Amino acid sequence: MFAIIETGGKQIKVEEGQEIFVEKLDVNEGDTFTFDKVLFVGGDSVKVGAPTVEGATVTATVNKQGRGKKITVFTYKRRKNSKRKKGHRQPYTKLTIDKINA
């Protein structure tokens, strides 16, 4: 019913049919991405992957490759005439789950 996948440098709890936001993947819009590294399967029968579950794939369809909300990074030092200002937007990929395998 729920699965744990390790993608990007992070771990995410997922369920059949929900939307997730991860660090950028090399994929185009429309395509189907499949995740390998599955760590936990929370179904009727529970599978624990201490390393991996050995099988255990999660399927998803890519939609909306995108770049995130912008943040201004600002720092200064008091009686010293130094300050720095710069902008950052972080990329992401948006996915919807369809399959949890085991």
């Binding site: 992070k10 995410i12 709890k13 997730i20 936001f21 991860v22």
Partner: protein, 144 residues
């Protein structure tokens, strides 16, 4: 990813009974402070009040160790010049021991407005008798 339970809002608080007979003041105090704080719930958030009610009833069989009774003076000032007052631990336990226990619970809680509220979930009684039977209170045993 933000997959993270925080919204404790709509929690369920329960009611507990601990008895003071033959315990140490500080050790009972710290465990009770933890329960009032809510540190024992898998659902715990510091910005909303989880945690639940604790009833202490014997508050007269409190036990000190060493010479705490004659030492351990308590102090207070009235903001009036030379207005420092005092009382020693043993005679505070002998007259108004409920104050003795609840003071040392409340000194172990945060001093925010949420913390001073969490200290209001505490009821102390000298002697083994209390009025709170409609709340259906459960016995809790000090799991040291």
């Amino acid at each position: 990813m933000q997959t993270f339970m925080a919204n404790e809002s709509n929690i369920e608080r329960k009611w507990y009974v601990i008895d003071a007979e033959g315990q140490t003041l500080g050790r009972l105090s710290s465990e009770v402070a933890s329960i009032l704080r809510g540190k024992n719930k898998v659902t715990y958030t510091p910005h909303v009040d989880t945690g639940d009610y604790v009833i202490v009833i014997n508050a007269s069989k409190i036990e000190f160790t060493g010479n705490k009774e004659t030492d351990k003076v308590y102090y207070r000032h009235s903001n009036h010049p030379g207005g420092i007052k005092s009382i020693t631990a043993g005679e505070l336990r002998r007259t108004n021991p409920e104050r003795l226990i609840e003071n040392s619970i409340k000194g172990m809680l945060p001093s925010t407005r949420l913390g001073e509220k969490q200290g209001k979930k505490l009821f102390v009684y000298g002697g083994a008798e209390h009025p709170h039977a409609a709340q259906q209170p459960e016995n809790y045993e000090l799991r040291g």
